[PDB]
Amino acid sequence: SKGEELFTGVVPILVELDGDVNGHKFSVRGEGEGDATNGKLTLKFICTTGKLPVPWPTLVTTLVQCFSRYPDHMKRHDFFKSAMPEGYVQERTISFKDDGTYKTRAEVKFEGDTLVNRIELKGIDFKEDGNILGHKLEYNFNSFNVYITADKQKNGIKANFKIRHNVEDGSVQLADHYQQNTPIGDGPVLLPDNHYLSTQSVLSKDPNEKRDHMVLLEFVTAAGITHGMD
């Protein structure tokens, strides 16, 4: 790509999310930076409307897979960077087992030198005293493999995967993710062979921050392609 060239160094990131879950309206803003060469990013998120009405871990996947490290032998399979700078639309349905559903639409693109993720999230049918609206989820995350496939009649990619959030009573809350990404612009993109993204996330708190917030460190490497060396 020349989309690839845009990620050779450290890139500033801005994330803005506008949310509505059972009529609770909220906003989140995140800032930090990404380094695709090492598949690493660092971000701090603030709930700008006050107290966040859902648990922070439930928003992680919604809150820039263009910062994945693709190994050399797999560069031909990186849709996310090939869509830059014009970007891509990322849509999900996140279905919480025995509870509500989030639907998300985001545009991920450059605005000047900053990579921007701008999201709208709508959440419906949540149980007012279930694990989500009742804040019964632990503050932690885990590592996941996200399987990527080429959209079979169209010009983007797809992914489905399960996130498992720990609940405070020792159980797990499932969040089944269905994802589609499609380019904003018109010019050629890379359509990948089947592979996956090996993802790891660590959450923390800033001892000096008294707003409702999440600090996040993430490492993401692509894997699972046998051919393309030398």
Author numbering: 2 to 64, 68 to 234
Please give me the paper's original passages concerning this structure.
We have used superfolder GFP (sfGFP) as a model system to exemplify and understand mechanism of action of these two different nnPTM routes. SfGFP26 is an intrinsically fluorescent protein derived from the original Aequorea victoria GFP. H148 plays an important role in defining the fluorescence properties of GFP through the contribution of the imidazole side chain to the charge transfer network that modulates chromophore protonation state equilibrium, and maintaining local structural integrity. We have demonstrated the versatility of genetically encoded phenyl azide chemistry to positively switch protein function through two different non-native PTM events: photolysis and bioorthogonal modification.
The likely explanation for the absence of N2 is that the azide moiety accesses multiple conformations through rotation but we cannot rule out loss of N2 during X-ray bombardment during data collection. The H148azF mutation removes two H-bonds from the Cro hydroxyl group to: (1) the original 148 imidazole and; (2) the OH side chain of T203. The structure suggests T203 side chain rotates so that the hydroxyl group is further from Cro (4.8 Å versus 2.7 Å in sfGFP) and poorly orientated to H-bond to Cro. There is also a shift in the position of the loop housing residue 148, bringing it closer to the adjacent β-strand 6 resulting in the expulsion of a water molecule. WB is observed at a similar position in other GFP variants (e.g. EGFP,43,46 the S65T GFP variant and YFP41) but absent in sfGFP148azF, with the nearest water molecule ∼7.5 Å away. The loop housing residue 148 shifts on substitution of His for azF, with one of the main consequences being closure of solvent channel and breaking the water interactions network through to the chromophore; it is narrower in sfGFP148azF with only a single water observed in the channel. Visual inspection and analysis using CAVER52 shows that the channel and water interaction network is similar in terms of pathway, width and residue positioning in original sfGFP, sfGFP148azF+1 and irradiated sfGFP148azF (c and S11†). The equivalent features are absent in dark state sfGFP148azF.
